[PDB]
Amino acid sequence: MQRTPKIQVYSRHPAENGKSNFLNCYVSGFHPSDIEVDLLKNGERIEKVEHSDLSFSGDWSFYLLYYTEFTPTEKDEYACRVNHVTLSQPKIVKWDRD
Amino acid sequence: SHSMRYFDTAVSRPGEPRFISVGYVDDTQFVRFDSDAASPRGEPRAPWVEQEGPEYWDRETQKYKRQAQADRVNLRKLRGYYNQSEDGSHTLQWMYGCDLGPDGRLLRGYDQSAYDGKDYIALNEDLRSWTAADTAAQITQRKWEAAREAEQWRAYLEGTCVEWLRRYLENGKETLQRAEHPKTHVTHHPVSDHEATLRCWALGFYPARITLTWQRDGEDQTQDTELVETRPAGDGTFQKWAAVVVPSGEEQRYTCHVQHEGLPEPLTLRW
Amino acid sequence: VRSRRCLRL
C-alpha cells in the first residue's frame, strides 16, 4: 500500500511577533516510511530542524513531527515542504494559524 | 484508563535493514532504539526512566538488538511467503502492549504485525488464538500454534506488562497522572456578505483524547468547515480545532462544546 | 520493559 501524507503547519504557542516560539510541521497518515520534510523561511530551508522518532497509528500509518525554533515577525512567511514517493511533486503548505 | 505500547518498524535495505522502535506510556514516549545509530542502545525519552539502573538499560538494549536481528530474518521469510523478488523494499511493523481500563485492570492485550502496511497476523482479545489475514500469514500462525505462542504472550501481557506499566505510572505519577485541561478560545473570520467562519481552539491539553463539536441552537452540526486531526504541540501537550461556516450575522446561534478528561465538566464557548 | 520474546514469523 502507498498512502499520501497529511500535513499540518502550525506553531506550538499562539504566535506573537517578537516572542520566541516553535514552528511545527506534522506529517501523518503516510506509507511507506521514507519522507522529506523541511521548514521554509521566506522560501529558503531552515537549517536547525529536528523531528520526533518514527511511530505509526492503528492503521499502520506513520506520523512524524518536525519542528524548529523561530521568532514570528510580520512579513517573514513560513512554510512546510514535504516530499514522498506518492507525490508527483513536493508539496508546500504555508504557515497560517489563528 | 492507561496503556503501555511498543511500536517496531523494520524497513529492508538493498544488507542490514533499518530497525526503529518506540515505546509509549499513554500519550508519552519513554524509550527509543534505532539501528542506524552509531552504537545502538535503548535510549530514554522521559525522565521517569532516566534513573533506572544500568542493568535495566543493558537488558532492554540486548532485547532490542535481538529483535533487530530477528527482523532481518523476518523480512527475508516474508519475502519467501509471498514469493517476492529481492530488488524492492518492504516494511514490517509490530505493535504490542497492554491497555488497562479505568479499574484499572487489564482491559486488552496486543500483539499484531503488518507487512507493506497490510494486516499480517494479530493476537485476538482472548490472548489464546490468532487472526491471520492471509493464508501466507497462516504459515506463521501454524508455527506459533505449534509453539504455544499465545500462551507466552498471555503470560507477558497479563503479567510483567501491567506490572511495569503500573510501576512506570508510579514513578512518573507527577507526569503521567495529571491531565491538562485545554485552553480554549474562538476566532471569527468574515468570508463574504453571506458567510463567516467560526474556529474553536483547544490547546495545551493532555491526554490527546478530546472531543470538539459545534452546535447550532443546541443541535450538533456537520458541514462544517473542518475538524482537524489532534496534533502534538511539541512539549508533551496536544492541540486541535474545529471550525464551521455560518451565515454572516448569526454567530450567536453557534456554540462550541469541549469534552476532555482534565475538565471538571464539559466546556461551552462561543464567539 | 520489552518482552523477552522476539517476533518471529
Report how this structure was experimentally obtained. X-ray
Residue A65: HSE in the Cβ half-sphere, 13 Å Cα cutoff:
19
Give Cβ neighbours of residue A81 (< 8 Å, ≥ 6 apart): A36, A37, A38, A39, A40, A45, A90, A91, A92, A93
Q: Which of B167, B221, B204 is nearest to B49 (CA)?
A: B167
Residue of A nearest to B23 (CA): A55
Q: Where are the domains of chain B?
A: 1-178, 179-269
Q: What is the CA radius of gyration of chain C?
A: 7
Residue B183 near residue B175 (C-beta atoms within 8 A): no
Binding-face residues of B in 48-67 toward C, CB within 8 A: 60, 63-64, 66-67
- Determine if residue B26 is left, alpha or beta; phi over 0 gives left, psi from -120 to 50 gives alpha, anything else beta: left
Residue B120 near residue B106 (C-beta atoms within 8 A): no
Please state whether the peptide bond connecting residue A32 to the residue before it is cis, i.e. omega within 30 degrees of 0. Answer: yes
Pairing verdict, β A91-94 and A55-56: unpaired
Q: Where are the alpha helices (DSSP H) in chain B?
A: 54-81, 137-147, 149-156, 162-171, 173-176
Give dist(CA A66, CA B19) in Å, integer: 20
C-alpha cell belonging to residue B39: 552504537
DSSP annotation of A10? E
Q: How far is C5 from chain B (nearest CA, A)?
A: 8
Residue of C nearest to B93 (CA): C7
CATH number given to B179-269: 2.60.40.10
Considering the segment(s) A1-98 as one domain, its CATH architecture is Sandwich (2.60)
- Alpha-carbon torsion, ordered B243, B247, B252, B255, to 10 deg: -30
Instruction: Identify residue B241 by its one-letter amino acid code.
Output: W
What pairs with residue B258 in β-bridges?
B212, B267
Find where cell 506510556 sits. Answer: B25
CB count within 10 Å of CB B185 equals 15
Resolution (A): 2.5
C-alpha cell belonging to residue B195: 458567510
- Taking an 8 Å cut-off on Cβ atoms, the answer to whether C7 and B63 are in contact is no
Give dist(CA B231, CA A65) in Å, integer: 9
Pairing verdict, β A50-51 and A55-56: unpaired
Exposure letters A46-70 (e unless 16+ CB within 10 A, then b): beeeeebbbbbeeebbbbbbbbbeb
Residue B8 near residue B94 (C-beta atoms within 8 A): yes
At residue B80, φ and ψ (nearest 5 deg) are -75, -40
Residue B201 near residue B185 (C-beta atoms within 8 A): yes
Do chain B and chain C touch with ≥3 beta carbon pairs under 8 Å? yes
Find the helix or strand (DSSP H, E) in which B188 lies.
strand B183-190
DSSP annotation of B181? P
Give Cβ neighbours of residue B236 (< 8 Å, ≥ 6 apart): B28, B206
- Taking an 8 Å cut-off on Cβ atoms, the answer to whether B73 and C3 are in contact is no
Option in A1, A22, A28 nearest B229 (CB): A28
Give dist(CA B9, CA B178) in Å, integer: 30
Pairing verdict, β B43-44 and B106-115: unpaired
Residue B158 near residue B185 (C-beta atoms within 8 A): no
Give Cβ neighbours of residue B244 (< 8 Å, ≥ 6 apart): B197, B198, B214, B221, B223, B224, B225, B254
Neighboring chain C residues of B78 at a CB cutoff of 8 Å: 9
Option in B63, B74, B153 nearest C2 (CB): B63
Do chain A and chain B touch with ≥3 beta carbon pairs under 8 Å? yes
- Alpha-carbon torsion, ordered B58, A50, A95, B22, to 10 deg: -20
- Taking an 8 Å cut-off on Cβ atoms, the answer to whether B156 and C6 are in contact is no
Considering the segment(s) B1-178 as one domain, its CATH architecture is 2-Layer Sandwich (3.30)
Give dist(CA A59, CA A65) in Å, integer: 18
Q: Which of B51, B128, B140, B146 is nearest to B94 (CA)?
A: B140
Please tell me if residue B45 touches chain A, with a CB cutoff of 8 Å.
Answer: yes
What pairs with residue A30 in β-bridges?
A62
- Beta strands (DSSP E) in A1-98 are 6-11, 21-30, 36-41, 44-45, 50-51, 55-56, 62-70, 78-83, 91-94
Helix axes B149-156, B137-147, angle to 10 degrees: 80
